[PDB]
Structure formats: structure tokens, C-alpha cells
Amino acid sequence: NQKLIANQFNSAIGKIQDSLSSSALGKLQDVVNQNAQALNTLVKQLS
């Protein structure tokens, strides 16, 4: 079934791009948002 298996793999890889061009990286965006919020609170405590 080699040709069928290669075709299924190629279309499954092609759907990852179309899912990512729409997000799904929330676990990496949370870390950035938390560190920026903590530095902003530290700086606003000087007033």
C-alpha cells in the first residue's frame, strides 16, 4: 500500500499549514504576556 500511504502522509502535512495560516500558540503567548505584565507592575509601583 506504499502509494496510498505516501499520499495520506502528504495531505496530512498539507493540512497543518492551512490550520496554521488562520490562534493555536496560546501556550507560548501566555509566557510572554505574563512577563510583560509583571515588569509593568514593577515599574508602576514607583508612583
Binding site: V43, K44, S47
Partner: protein
């Protein structure tokens, strides 16, 4: 009613102590591209620093 208030002349592009009308600080003065409204005196940023 009070006395007069003296003024020196401003120097750009080097580290000074400044005093603009009761707002003191220390830093480097440089010409800007910001445009205020004609009643505003100074600007701040997100963290409320001048």
C-alpha cells in the same frame, strides 16, 4: 506674588540635570518629531514615565 525666576540656556545631546518649570530630572535632550496639542506641557508613556 513672588520674585522673578532666572533661566539659563538649553544644551542638547549631552547628559545634564534639567528643570523645566518645576519638572526635574536627568538625561539627554534631543529634538523630537512628536506634536503636542497647544495646551499640553509634557508627555508620558505606558508606564507613566516622562
Amino acid at each position: 506674588v513672588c520674585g522673578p525666576k532666572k533661566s539659563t540656556n538649553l544644551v542638547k545631546n549631552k547628559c545634564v540635570n534639567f528643570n523645566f518649570n518645576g519638572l526635574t530630572g536627568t538625561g539627554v535632550l534631543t529634538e523630537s518629531n512628536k506634536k503636542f496639542l497647544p495646551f499640553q506641557q509634557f508627555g508620558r508613556d505606558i508606564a507613566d514615565t516622562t
